[PDB]
Design a binder for this molecule. Structure first.
Ligand SMILES: CN(C)c1ccc(C(=C2C=CC(=[N+](C)C)C=C2)c2ccccc2)cc1
Lengths: 186, 184
């Protein structure tokens, strides 16, 4: 498919050279298409990227769907999910493209609203854990909406802003966070 | 010089590091490519100088603001709330992270940004150490907790820019509550 070929080539280029450095010209020549056609299917480079992110996020959800069954309780799922977010983002080849993209279009309303919709599927994973945990007596949380967003934003701050490298140490700090956080809810 | 510093800081906040070009700085600061050179030499040296000043200002602000909080528990709530409102340092985080995910190899400037992040972390260290001394909680690894708090708060600040300010303060106070209640 010529739309899927552009998505695939765009992905490789965004992996290889990041979001900023990659031009529509490159995507177009390696896809064997034209800017006119790229514009047709995705309007902008920004929107091509969001489409890739949406396909990637769907794959992340399916991975969590099966990876979570190895965790009996919702307390364990919260530990696991946070650890998984950390370790996945440590090697994820699009991670740098994602950082460049976000750090440029986070104040841009029309794109930043679509970013929010992607981010809210992460908050939704926390909502399930926390709701379902209420239902089984693991904790008692009144505002699951608020706590899910807090957890989502806190966990990803630790992931993104930690320059205290060594992956072993990063995993320990994330587990310490998860302990303190869940202890605070009891 | 200060015209270059002002427009840079603002373009960096708005577009990030990469998307901000020197030509645009000198276009909007009414200067030359050769005037930015001499004052700052390179684009990244300008940025790093902005960061040093931003951290200075943030630190002035907190030194003056922390007196209003008597207990270290209260200093932690306030510090975190202020991080949402301050004009200093925190508005540049996306730019800082973008810059870090490029010149992390270049150990000449990497080392200078480690010293900047150590300051950003040491405020929590003081809070948590002093809270230990004043019996507000027991923390056996303050260095780890300070790092977790700093980065967790930064994430709540940085990833919620899209919201009503009072709501963001409500989200942050809850976090603050949960976190300190998790130390007990
Ligand atoms: C590949 N992978 C596992 C991930 C990839 C990206 C994210 C992110 C994120 C941060 C906060 C969010 N919130 C607060 C909803 C949502 C996403 C994210 C990290 C840095 C820059 C922009 C977004 C997380 C996981």
């Amino acid at each position: 498919n010529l739309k899927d070929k552009i998505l695939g080539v765009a992905k490789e280029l965004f992996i290889k050279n990041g979001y900023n450095a990659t031009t529509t010209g490159e995507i177009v020549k390696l896809s064997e298409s034209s800017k006119g056609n790229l514009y047709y299917h995705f309007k902008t480079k920004e929107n091509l990227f969001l489409e890739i992110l949406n396909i990637e996020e769907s794959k992340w959800q399916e991975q969590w769907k099966s990876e979570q069954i190895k965790a009996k309780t919702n307390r364990e799922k919260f530990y696991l999910y946070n650890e998984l977010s950390l370790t996945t983002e440590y090697y994820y080849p699009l991670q740098n493209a994602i950082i460049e993209f976000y750090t440029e279009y986070y104040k841009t309303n029309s794109i930043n609203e679509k970013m929010n919709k992607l981010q809210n599927k992460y908050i939704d994973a926390y909502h399930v854990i926390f709701k379902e945990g209420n239902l089984n007596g693991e904790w008692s949380i009144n505002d699951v909406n608020a706590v899910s967003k807090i957890a989502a934003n806190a966990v990803n701050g630790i992931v993104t802003f930690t320059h205290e490298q060594n992956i072993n140490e990063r995993i320990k700090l994330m587990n310490k966070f998860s302990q303190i956080f869940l202890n605070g809810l009891s």
